[PDB]
Amino acid sequence: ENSKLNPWAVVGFIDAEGSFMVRVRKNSKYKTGWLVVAIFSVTVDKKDLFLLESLKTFFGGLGSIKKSGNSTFSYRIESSEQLTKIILPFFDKYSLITEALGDYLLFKKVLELMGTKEHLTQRGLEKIVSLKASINKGLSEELQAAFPQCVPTPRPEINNKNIPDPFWLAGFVSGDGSFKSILKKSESIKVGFQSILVFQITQHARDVKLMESLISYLGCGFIEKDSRGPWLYYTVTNFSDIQGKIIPFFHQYKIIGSKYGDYQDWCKIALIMQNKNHLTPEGLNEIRALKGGMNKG
DNA sequence: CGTACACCTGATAATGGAGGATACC
DNA sequence: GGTATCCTCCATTAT
DNA sequence: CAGGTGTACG
Ligand SMILES: [Mg+2]
Ligand SMILES: [Mg+2]
Ligand SMILES: [Mg+2]
Numbered sequence: 195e196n197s198k199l200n201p202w203a204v205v206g207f208i209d210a211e212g213s214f215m216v217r218v219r220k221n222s223k224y225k226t227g228w229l230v231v232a233i234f235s236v237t238v239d240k241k242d243l244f245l246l247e248s249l250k251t252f253f254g255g256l257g258s259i260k261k262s263g264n265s266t267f268s269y270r271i272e273s274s275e276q277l278t279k280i281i282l283p284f285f286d287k288y289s290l291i292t293e294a295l296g297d298y299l300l301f302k303k304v305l306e307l308m309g310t311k312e313h314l315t316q317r318g319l320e321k322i323v324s325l326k327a328s329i330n331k332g333l334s335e336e337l338q339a340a341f342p343q344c345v346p347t348p349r350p351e352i353n354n355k356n357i358p359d360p361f362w363l364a365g366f367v368s369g370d371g372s373f374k375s376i377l378k379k380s381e382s383i384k385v386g387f388q389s390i391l392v393f394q395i396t397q398h399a400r401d402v403k404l405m406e407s408l409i410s411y412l413g414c415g416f417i418e419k420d421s422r423g424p425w426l427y428y429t430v431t432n433f434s435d436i437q438g439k440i441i442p443f444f445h446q447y448k449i450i451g452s453k454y455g456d457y458q459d460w461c462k463i464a465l466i467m468q469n470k471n472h473l474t475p476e477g478l479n480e481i482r483a484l485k486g487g488m489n490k491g
Numbered sequence: 492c493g494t495a496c497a498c499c500t501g502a503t504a505a506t507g508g509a510g511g512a513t514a515c516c
Numbered sequence: 517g518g519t520a521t522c523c524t525c526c527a528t529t530a531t
Numbered sequence: 532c533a534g535g536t537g538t539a540c541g
């Protein structure tokens with residue numbers, strides 16, 4: 195387990211796992227008829243709770259860490275004042291690079307409006323609803339019916355987004371990457387199974403450009419599409435690239451969260467493979483046991 | 492024998508919401 | 517009253 | 532996120 199936090203790592207992690215949300219709830223007690231709330235949220239498996247704790251401390255002890263689902267916890271900041279004072283200045287200096295950036299810049303604009311209390315104003319609210327419409331899944335049915343006049347504000351959409359620091363990658367992969375160990379059944383290998391190591395990152399196709407630039411950035415790998423939908427894998431299967439490129443990279447720029455343990459086990463598997471012990475029965479069982487302990491606690 | 496890119500599919504916690512209660516001015 | 521935050525729970529799909 | 536397979540190639 196690893197919870198040392200660096201700004202760029204946090205940004206990578208938030209690009210992987212965070213959400214910038216705007217809620218506009220109907221409620222007769224508010225003059226406009228609507229309550230406007232802005233929320234910054236990161237949800238993880240409960241095995242990474244310690245990571246949410248380091249994140250809270252990273253952001254000045256602000257926010258709340260709460261049970262989200264069956265085996266997950268949420269870290270959330272929902273105080274307008276608090277979002278403006280620390281969250282915005284952080285992400286203005288250390289900018290997101292995925293499509294999450296677009297949600298961020300919209301979310302930032304609603305906060306600018308909330309800062310001058312324009313959300314408590316009919317025209318202010320309409321402008322916020324226009325913003326909400328281009329954030330995440332956009333307008334609810336109830337909001338669309340309540341403001342059927344409103345033109346979504348254009349989704350900003352950046353240009354060549356280029357990996358800003360090695361720690362960014364560290365954080366990003368700590369969220370949406372994986373270090374895979376496979377045992378493939380083989381008829382040519384004496385021992386009956388091929389030990390294969392795979393480094394992989396998964397992301398929605400809308401971030402194809404970023405995904406493609408990982409091939410230059412790391413000097414290896416390739417992209418594939420999931421035939422079942424819009425979802426891309428950056429993948430390294432070449433064991434020379436794993437040892438010469440990926441393993442050294444994440445030895446310097448460290449995985450955060452419980453996935454650090456997994457990278458460490460994956461490395462041990464790579465050592466057994468380096469020494470060629472994976473083609474003996476004992477080395478194969480060593481990998482099976484390292485393989486089964488992985489992603490646990 | 493052994494490896495590696497192209498292709499395949501399962502699991503489930505995230506992704507991104509929601510509703511009700513209460514604090515605060 | 518008006519407004520701002522806390523607290524608990526969830527269905528579909530990006531991991 | 533994660534576990535596999537088919538098969539060309541040295
Ligand atoms: Mg993600
Ligand atoms: Mg994750
Ligand atoms: Mg998951």
